[PDB]
Amino acid sequence: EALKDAQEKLELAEKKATDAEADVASLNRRIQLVEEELDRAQERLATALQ
Amino acid sequence: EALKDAQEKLELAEKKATDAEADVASLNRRIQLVEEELDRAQERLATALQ
Amino acid sequence: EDETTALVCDNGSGLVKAGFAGDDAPRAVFPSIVGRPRHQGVMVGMGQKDSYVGDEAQSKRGILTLKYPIEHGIITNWDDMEKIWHHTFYNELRVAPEEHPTLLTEAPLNPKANREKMTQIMFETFNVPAMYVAIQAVLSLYASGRTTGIVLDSGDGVTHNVPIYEGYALPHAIMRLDLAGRDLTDYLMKILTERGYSFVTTAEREIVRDIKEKLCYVALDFENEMATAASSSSLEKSYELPDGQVITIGNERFRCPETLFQPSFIGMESAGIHETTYNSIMKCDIDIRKDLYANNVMSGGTTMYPGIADRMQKEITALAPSTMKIKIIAPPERKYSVWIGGSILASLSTFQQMWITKQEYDEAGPSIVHRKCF
Amino acid sequence: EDETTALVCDNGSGLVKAGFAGDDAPRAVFPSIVGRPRHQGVMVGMGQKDSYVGDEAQSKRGILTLKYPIEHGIITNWDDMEKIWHHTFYNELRVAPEEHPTLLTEAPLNPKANREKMTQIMFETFNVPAMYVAIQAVLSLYASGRTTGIVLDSGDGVTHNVPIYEGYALPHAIMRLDLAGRDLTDYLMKILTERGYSFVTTAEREIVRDIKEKLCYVALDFENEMATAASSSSLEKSYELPDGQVITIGNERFRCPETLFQPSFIGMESAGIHETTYNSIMKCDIDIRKDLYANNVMSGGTTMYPGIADRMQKEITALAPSTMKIKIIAPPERKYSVWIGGSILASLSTFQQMWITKQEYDEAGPSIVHRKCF
Amino acid sequence: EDETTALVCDNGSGLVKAGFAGDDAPRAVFPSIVGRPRHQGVMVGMGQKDSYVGDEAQSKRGILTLKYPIEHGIITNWDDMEKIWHHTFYNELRVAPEEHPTLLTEAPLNPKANREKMTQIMFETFNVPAMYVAIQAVLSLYASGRTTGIVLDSGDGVTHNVPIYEGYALPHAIMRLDLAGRDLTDYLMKILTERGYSFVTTAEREIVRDIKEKLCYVALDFENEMATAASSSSLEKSYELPDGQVITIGNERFRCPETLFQPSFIGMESAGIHETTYNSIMKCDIDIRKDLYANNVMSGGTTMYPGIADRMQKEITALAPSTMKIKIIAPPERKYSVWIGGSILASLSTFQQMWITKQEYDEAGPSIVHRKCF
């Protein structure tokens, strides 16, 4: 019982790690997209300011 | 043994999730800060364009 | 002597828990049962003894019809309750109630007549200097040593839920849910019948109560455990009856506590215990909810089943915002938490002025319970 | 035929009131409930039916679980609401919406989505030439024939307050108070447990609604009536359940409507109906207060209890300047005033150019409700 | 010690700003709120504490009803103000007022009774050697280091406008406009309701105050920003409640500060803040107007919104002669400008003879405020 629960909690903690890592990757893609769009907003801003 | 291993894999998978959560949380702070600067750069750009 | 000690009794249904205030554990814990000789006896030099009270009735079970005098936190029969208290004081504790102030516990949203008649008996049956009637859930909160929490109280009497914040209390947010240990016992003897085991009488109704007190557990997922009941291995357990008959119970075991989370099995619409906790927390102010989610306290005898805390955690976390972390604090020793909360309360120095005095009752009558106390 | 006529439907929580325009009384009145069968039936030749709507649900009550779809003026589920409108048009009224312009009533300070989705269901579910959504309190003012007044409108939905002066409206002085007759129903079942009367499922929850709408009244002064409740007489009344259980209720009976004047009893900081009326009048311009104080209008379902007008007159007269004479006009028939107000409004030929047409919806979409009406 | 230091307190509504004179920033800044336990507490060993004052009330918000004791620059409740000052001196600053002269700020065109009762409390509650009451706008002008300007003072209490030239002051040209931070908060919780978010009580009224303190901004053109609200992208912001509920606010965000420039939204005729500045400047002599146009000073807490300075510049430049250039000087730190102006004033050596002495009060009474000071 401690094992079915520890194992299911493992499948769910591995799933949470998979989802958290999927979120790390999906966010890392989004962070980079907002960084790249920020660089573009800053470049467009430097252009708009010039 | 299957339990201690399920528990160690669970603590490790919880840590894969906690480290992936720390990384996604670091990235969420970066998305919030960088996307806030995207929107501020975009607003500064909108202001520069206006 | 100084402070006089004090006496504390928990009577939810099913068990009297009683002892001295100022101690960590009750001296006497016994079943709240009045068992009467149904069969006419034919010998000479028996008893006679009109009725047996306490674990005496458990020992001599087969002769007796057993009557629980408290149902749903309500005393059905007053003489039977007086007999139970007569048994606590004289048979176990060996005290004169004249020499001790007595704390009684009592359940939320309970008829006024129980509190008022309970005080009427305490003054005009066992002459006593002072007494108090107190709410079960607040006492368990004191026992857990926390100032804040939502106390899920479920005894053999009824299930109750009281949110508290920094002391205080929220009357509108108090919820009472008609489920209990006893209703799980009635469900359980009904779900044994499909296996061929038929327990029809009060005596072996307490045998399925004993089964359920150890064999039963709560599934961390009901459907998953019911699916793995196809390959029966660990889910079956052999149980020995006092007859010497052997009982073998499979999936039937964990779907008895499942009724707390699915009252559609009992046939009541009234929501499962995790949705009742949401119903209480939702009635509370927005600000405090953060710690009520994280400070859920389980108390009582029918929160003892293995895996209840984990199931409540998964369901409340699934329903709630995952923005905040849902800690459930369910101690082992949670069965006696109400009595320990009564021990700590009567040991409190300030509380020694908030007693209902015998004098104040003699002037102002039995109705003063609600006027002074919650 | 000339005008075609029109259909008027009032659907505050608790009761549907519906019928043709320019009929003075409606053509259907029934409870806004959708009742689904909780217990599986084992017979051949039954129904089956997914759900029972209106009074079929009232009749077959004990099998069912009953859901109100409208809670606090908000539609909580939209298949349940669609079925209620499907039922009005095709069972009692026996009309095609294709023949008829449809007027619907709607609540002060309500989420935009209730108007915007309501117009979509009327245009796209039941094909209709034109429609309108109209604020409840203005319709009840139209029913009592007035140009000026402060309207206190309360159903089993929510309590709303709208001041009006020679037509117009003051948007900043419109007050919404989330106390309904329905919260009084929950308060009533909560108070009944003090006398040991435990009611727990939706079916007997509407039995306490049925107790509420003919035994309850407002105390003409609370402390005075509660003091004389020491000597129980006319303050206690027998009541018969469809079970055959007799229920006797006392001080309990008038302290349930008291919750409107004392929201501390239901556990909310939000000021009483007299105080919220004063809050609206204080937000209004200085001159128009003179006539608003002397033109207080009561409408809706939970303004029906005896002693409300009399009490509101004492409490507003006590709080307000006594240099002017507080006058409340609380007519009989006030449960239906919102519907009567719609039946007169849809009978105005100038208002027949103020409808939202099907063509305007097809051209400009759901958002146009807040671009043509209130 | 030399000079004895001095004490300075700004009490416009909403915030006490207090500290020593002779420092660049106040030590203590906290909300001017007296929050009372509305819910009766049920524990033993609580508090009791009749009421909580300051940011203690912010921490324990959900229990409390909060009362601002100052409304529109007017003290509504005097004991509550005395409690707030008792909290400043003993809880934060840890001073005996007997050891320090105390400067109070106060708002223009304010009832005489506030100044006279404020002095009466300062002498006959906290025994003090000397005090002064000073006008808010002149103190902000001193803090900005300029001898000339038109000071637009808007706190949470009321909006005020004082033109000054080379020192001096123009009594006829002083304007007071009943708009504030607090009225924007009441407008804001009203404009959230159309989105479905309903904040009905004092505790979450301070949650929309916190929202408005960061999310809200002023449009550089209102109609243009309301038009681009059709394509919602940057105009929406997610906000986290302390409940864990998420709020998403679009065009509703910037039209809350728009009320300062359009009081037709609140329903008041009283002109927008830029026309009030024109109304003040037009009442001034022809000669000085050139520098008053170019030396507009913003002060107070409700001039903190991003883009206010730009909007005021565009509107005043649009209305005024474009013959002269309209510079607006709105510093960051403008929130604390009144307190800094009080710090500099009590640090001035000459000002140390213009104090209202305790002796001069004891001889000539409380009425001398207006006689000595402006």
Curated annotation (Swiss-Prot), chains A, B:
- The portions of this protein that span the membrane are none
Its annotated compartments are: Cytoplasm, Cytoskeleton
> What triggers its expression?
Induced in stimulated quiescent cells.
Source domain of life: Eukaryota
Family recorded in the similarity comment: Belongs to the tropomyosin family.
Domain note: The molecule is in a coiled coil structure that is formed by 2 polypeptide chains. The sequence exhibits a prominent seven-residues periodicity.
Q: What additional remark is attached to this entry?
A: The sequences of cardiac and skeletal muscles are identical.
Assembly and interactions?
A: Homodimer. Heterodimer of an alpha (TPM1, TPM3 or TPM4) and a beta (TPM2) chain. Interacts with HRG (via the HRR domain); the interaction contributes to the antiangiogenic properties of the histidine/proline-rich region (HRR) of HRG. Interacts (via N-terminus) with LMOD2 (via N-terminus) and TMOD1 (via N-terminus).
| Function according to Swiss-Prot or TrEMBL | Binds to actin filaments in muscle and non-muscle cells. Plays a central role, in association with the troponin complex, in the calcium dependent regulation of vertebrate striated muscle contraction. Smooth muscle contraction is regulated by interaction with caldesmon. In non-muscle cells is implicated in stabilizing cytoskeleton actin filaments.
What protein name does the entry list? Tropomyosin alpha-1 chain
| Organism (species) | Mus musculus (Mouse)
Curated annotation (Swiss-Prot), chains C, D, E:
Keyword annotations for this protein, in alphabetical order, are: Acetylation, ATP-binding, Cytoplasm, Cytoskeleton, Hydrolase, Methylation, Muscle protein, Nucleotide-binding, Oxidation
Query: Which Enzyme Commission numbers does its entry carry?
Result: 3.6.4.-
InterPro entries, per the entry? Actin, Actin/actin-like_CS, Actin_CS, ATPase_NBD
Any one GO CC term of this protein is:
cytoplasm
Residue segments, region Interaction with alpha-actinin = 109-122, 357-369
Give the modified residues of type N6-malonyllysine: K60
> Could you describe the post-translational modifications of this protein?
Oxidation of Met-43 and Met-46 by MICALs (MICAL1, MICAL2 or MICAL3) to form methionine sulfoxide promotes actin filament depolymerization. MICAL1 and MICAL2 produce the (R)-S-oxide form. The (R)-S-oxide form is reverted by MSRB1 and MSRB2, which promotes actin repolymerization. Monomethylation at Lys-83 (K84me1) regulates actin-myosin interaction and actomyosin-dependent processes. Demethylation by ALKBH4 is required for maintaining actomyosin dynamics supporting normal cleavage furrow ingression during cytokinesis and cell migration.
Superkingdom classification of source: Eukaryota
Positions of post-translational Tele-methylhistidine modification: H72
Q: Write out the catalysed reaction.
A: ATP + H2O = ADP + phosphate + H(+)
- Where found, per UniProt? Cytoplasm, Cytoskeleton
Pfam families found in the cross-reference section: Actin
Q: Which Gene3D superfamilies match?
A: 3.30.420.40, Actin, Chain A, domain 4 (3.90.640.10)
Which residues are recorded as modified (Methionine (R)-sulfoxide)? M43, M46
Question: What terms describe the molecular function in GO for this protein?
Answer: ATP binding; hydrolase activity
Q: Does the keyword Hydrolase apply?
A: yes
**Any other noteworthy remark?**
In vertebrates 3 main groups of actin isoforms, alpha, beta and gamma have been identified. The alpha actins are found in muscle tissues and are a major constituent of the contractile apparatus. The beta and gamma actins coexist in most cell types as components of the cytoskeleton and as mediators of internal cell motility.
- Describe its function: Actins are highly conserved proteins that are involved in various types of cell motility and are ubiquitously expressed in all eukaryotic cells.
Instruction: Fill in the subunit field for this protein.
Output: Polymerization of globular actin (G-actin) leads to a structural filament (F-actin) in the form of a two-stranded helix. Each actin can bind to 4 others. Interacts with alpha-actinin. Identified in a complex composed of ACTA1, COBL, GSN AND TMSB4X. Interacts with TTID. Interacts (via its C-terminus) with USP25.
Family indicated by similarity: Belongs to the actin family.
Task: List the protein's name.
Answer: Actin, alpha skeletal muscle
Q: Which organism is it from?
A: Mus musculus (Mouse)
